[PDB]
Design a protein around this nucleic acid. Structure first.
Ligand code: M7G
Ligand code: SAH
Ligand code: MG
Ligand code: MG
Ligand code: ZN
Ligand code: ZN
Length: 852
RNA sequence: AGUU
């Protein structure tokens, strides 16, 4: 008789328009298309997925249900979501899209996303009038819905009969609009006997459609899976309404794809021993997956592993309810949906890490060489490089700036025996166990590899090589409270505007030549030190072996991959080396801006050195003082504004700017208070004394958003509060000028016990000196930071009350996201005594004293 | 189904 899909249909068509509206998305997975749909309106052709379809297809490609390869044919491509996504897949060489177009139908949208040069979409091409072509991958998403099941039925069969002749021992993913009608089930079964595969439900599909997808890589009972969907959809009628799960939309990159230029060539004599050891520490589940996704990293093998990560983050209770208005604001409640699930990370690797930078021109390479040799010499004018020791490393661990096996390990004499063993390999130019991650005690191998880095390259951070005194451009050991002052001093330097261009994924943009230039520091080292440093550079920085997780349809596996260039982001002195190359890169760009370095010079194979040496030796230091370089973050105030147009060398060096077309001139500021740097801008405040403060500031919502997050007590109240009181005291020392934050700060500290220890990292930022931890009176701590220890505060007159500590002007406070003025803020302002009384009751009966 |  009647099928469960048909019962579902009849009941779907009986819902009210508002009962259907809720059912349509109850418990489904959706994609955030807001950013993409406004990029499309602004006519942007990069990064954006052209429709919801790219994310839909991704779900299948993720689980290898279909693995597009060779020539891909996309029947009914529409705007081209599936076609644009396939263009960036490893084994894909060509994509052809056929769609009907015309009135009432989707026309393909031209894009410049990565691999556009192998995509060919055509309108005026009805596939039901089209002779089948040879292809290695057949996609089809055609399915015109209907409130009549039997109408949907014949439409589905029409699609099926159309599409069958395209199938011939090739990959395929085909939408089956209505799969529960008996005759379709019948036809699918005959199809499954001939071409194999299986029907699968996509979680991104709305509950208002029964659509399933016939994919080639799978086997299973058709009737069973269809009826499972039927029950699920039928269940979601009566289940209490669930707000859909929201994913982050796909990033399809930009630029042409040269498939032959992607594959990595591994130095097996360098990385072989490391692989071998991984292989036999996990020999029981070790295998080689030919279906690995890596385009530009060299794959070596895999072993099985239990899954790690979450799609969302644990919210802090104490703050969440002391900040009731922000329960509703989107920007705050969104930084929880960061996803570190195997899927989430494999997505990140594809779009951000699995890329390859073209080798810079010979002229560009010479410039970087000359500049680096000079820069290194400048950085070592007073200091010598030095080795760091076990004693030094151990002390740094015990001052744990919970990684707690860290303090156990260094005390283990057995741990250091392994370290010694590995060091003797490095002296012979070999590496056995230096592998890092992206996320039986293999833990020792990893704390040991970090130490050896620290031993050889730790001096850069510990001896403050990139402090402002030593590097002019640098800002190491300064802190948020000092950064804004440095920007204000820079603005006093005559010239062009202040430019702050962010590189897109800096660490992935580090090149072979960058690595070879940072390496030059070893020339200043003692022999025994150079030996160890040369081992670090050559064997582990220029030959990286990485463990990375990957979800598969039969479990999670750990992939072992390798890469010669790029930067290992989890390495010692990543900050310093980033700062160095960025300093060099910005000097290079200043030369081009000043006309010293021309297009002819970058292309010219033998660039005469005399010109660049002269510029550096006469102007270099002055130009370094025009900059503030913190790792990959820079602020540059050149001698004029030609710099904004100086783009040849910067792009050729691989340091492509973020969120701007590759050849569009940079836009800078002349108001230094609007310059972004280290995730902040900096306001100048006038105390009613008359003296001036330069405070750090940022969008208030991302300050509040971070503080509604634990790290990570599940579920400990007498520890989740101590994280909140840490934020609350940071807000007091650093963001006192914000009205909501300072008020919220007084609402937290009065709600949390007086001498309860504040722990856990607030932010692990290099410029966060964390001097807000002591359970000391905040005004006295504030006074030491902003008055007596402040070099830019001449009059050391102390502050006796919190009303001599200024705010931002209401206008400027509001512009930075403050909710003052909104009456919900007012109701919140007079309800925080209760909210305070709430958590104090939620904690218990202990030492409170009021900051109300 | 995609588009709002
Ligand atoms: O397949 P979609 O997710 O994209 O959903 P839709 O809107 O095209 O139509 C699918 C089925 O859902 C039913 N439908 C459509 N509308 C606008 C309504 C309904 N059902 C009810 N009770 N009220 C509606 O307004 C149709 O059966 C349609 O085939
Ligand atoms: N007979 C036909 N021949 C070619 N294309 C057709 C067709 N009938 C419908 N189509 C197109 O097929 C599309 C199905 S929706 C496909 C969207 C696509 N998967 C994406 O990710 O963007 C519709 O846009 C429709 O215009
Ligand atoms: Mg910046
Ligand atoms: Mg629809
Ligand atoms: Zn090693
Ligand atoms: Zn601000």
């Amino acid at each position: 008789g009647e099928t469960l899909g048909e019962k579902w249909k009849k009941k779907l068509n009986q819902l009210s328009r508002k009962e259907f509206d809720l059912y349509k998305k109850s418990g489904i997975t959706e994609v955030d298309r807001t950013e993409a749909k406004e990029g499309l309106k602004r006519g942007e052709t990069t990064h954006h997925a052209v429709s919801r379809g790219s994310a839909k297809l991704q779900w299948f490609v993720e689980r290898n249900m279909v693995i597009p390869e060779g020539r891909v044919i996309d029947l009914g491509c529409g705007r081209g979501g599936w076609s644009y996504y396939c263009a960036g897949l490893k084994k894909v060489t060509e994509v052809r899209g056929y769609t009907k177009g015309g009135p009432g139908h989707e026309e393909p949208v031209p894009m410049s996303t990565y691999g556009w040069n192998i995509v060919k979409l055509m309108s005026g091409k009805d596939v039901f009038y089209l002779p089948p072509e040879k292809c290695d991958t057949l996609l089809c998403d055609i399915g015109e819905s209907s409130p009549s099941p039997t109408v949907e039925e014949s439409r589905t069969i029409r699609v099926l009969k159309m599409v069958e002749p395209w199938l011939k021992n090739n990959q395929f993913c085909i939408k089956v609009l209505n799969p529960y009608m008996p005759t379709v089930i019948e036809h699918l079964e005959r199809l499954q006997r001939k071409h194999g595969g299986m029907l699968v439900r996509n979680p991104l599909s709305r509950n208002s459609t029964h659509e399933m997808y016939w994919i080639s890589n799978g086997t299973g009972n058709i009737v069973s899976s269809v009826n499972m969907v039927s029950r699920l959809l039928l269940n979601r009628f009566t289940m209490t309404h669930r707000r859909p799960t929201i994913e982050k939309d796909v990033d399809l990159g930009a630029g042409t794809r040269h498939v032959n230029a992607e594959p990595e060539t591994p130095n097996m004599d360098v990385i072989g021993e490391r692989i071998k050891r991984i292989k036999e520490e996990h020999n029981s589940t070790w295998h080689y997956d030919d279906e690995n996704p890596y385009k530009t990293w060299a794959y070596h093998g895999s072993y099985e592993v239990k899954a790690t990560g979450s799609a969302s983050s644990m919210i802090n209770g104490v703050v969440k309810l002391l900040t009731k208005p922000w329960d509703v604001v989107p920007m705050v409640t969104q930084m929880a949906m960061t996803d570190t699930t195997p899927f989430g990370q494999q997505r990140v690797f594809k779009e951000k890490v699995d890329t390859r930078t073209p080798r810079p021109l010979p002229g560009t390479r010479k410039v970087m060489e000359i500049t680096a040799e000079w820069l290194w010499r400048t950085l070592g004018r007073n200091k010598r490089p030095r080795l760091c020791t076990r004693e030094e490393f151990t002390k740094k661990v015990r001052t744990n700036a919970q990684w707690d096996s860290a303090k156990a390990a260094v005390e283990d004499e057995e741990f250091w025996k392994l370290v010694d063993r590995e060091r003797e390999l490095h002296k012979l130019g070999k590496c056995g166990s230096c592998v890092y991650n992206m996320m039986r005690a293999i833990w020792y191998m990893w704390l040991g590899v970090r130490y050896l880095e620290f031993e050889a390259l730790g001096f850069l951070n510990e001896d403050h090589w990139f402090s402002r005194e030593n590097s002019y451009s640098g800002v190491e050991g300064e802190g948020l409270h000092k950064l804004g002052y440095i920007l204000r001093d820079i603005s006093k330097i005559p010239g062009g505007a202040m430019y702050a261009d962010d590189t897109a994924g800096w660490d992935t943009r580090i090149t072979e030549d960058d690595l070879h230039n940072e390496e030059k520091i070893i020339q200043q080292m003692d022999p025994e030190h150079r030996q160890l440093a040369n081992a670090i550079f050559k064997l582990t920085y220029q030959n990286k072996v990485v463990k990375v997780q990957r979800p598969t349809p039969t479990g999670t596996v750990m992939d072992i991959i390798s890469r010669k260039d790029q930067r290992g982001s989890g390495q010692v002195g990543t900050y310093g080396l980033n700062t160095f190359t960025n300093m060099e890169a910005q000097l290079v760009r200043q030369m081009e801006g000043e006309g010293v370095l021309t297009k002819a010079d970058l292309e010219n194979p033998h660039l005469l050195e005399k010109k660049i040496t002269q510029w550096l030796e006469t102007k270099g230091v002055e130009r370094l003082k025009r900059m503030a370089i913190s790792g990959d973050d820079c602020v540059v105030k050149p001698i004029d504004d030609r710099f904004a147009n100086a783009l040849l060398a910067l792009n050729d060096m691989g340091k492509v700017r973020k969120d701007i077309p590759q050849w569009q001139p940079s836009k800078g500021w002349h108001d230094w208070q609007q310059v972004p740097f280290c995730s902040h801008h900096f306001h100048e405040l006038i105390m009613k004394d008359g003296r001036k403060l330069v405070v750090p500031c940022r969008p208030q919502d991302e300050l509040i958003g971070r503080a509604r997050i634990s790290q990570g007590a599940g579920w400990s109240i007498r520890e989740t509060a101590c994280l909140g009181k840490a934020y609350a005291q940071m807000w007091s020392l650093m963001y006192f000028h914000r009205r909501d934050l300072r008020l919220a700060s007084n609402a937290i500290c009065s709600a949390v016990p007086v001498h309860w220890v504040p722990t856990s990292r607030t932010t692990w930022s290099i410029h966060a000196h964390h001097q807000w931890m002591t359970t000391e009176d905040m005004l006295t701590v504030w006074n030491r930071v902003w008055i007596e220890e402040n070099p830019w505060m001449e009059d050391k007159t102390p502050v006796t009350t919190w009303e001599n500590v200024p705010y931002l002007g209401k206008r400027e406070d509001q512009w930075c996201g403050s909710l003052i003025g909104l009456t919900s803020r007012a109701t919140w302002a007079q309800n925080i005594p209760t909210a305070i009384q709430q958590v104090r009751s939620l904690i218990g009966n202990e030492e409170f004293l009021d900051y109300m």
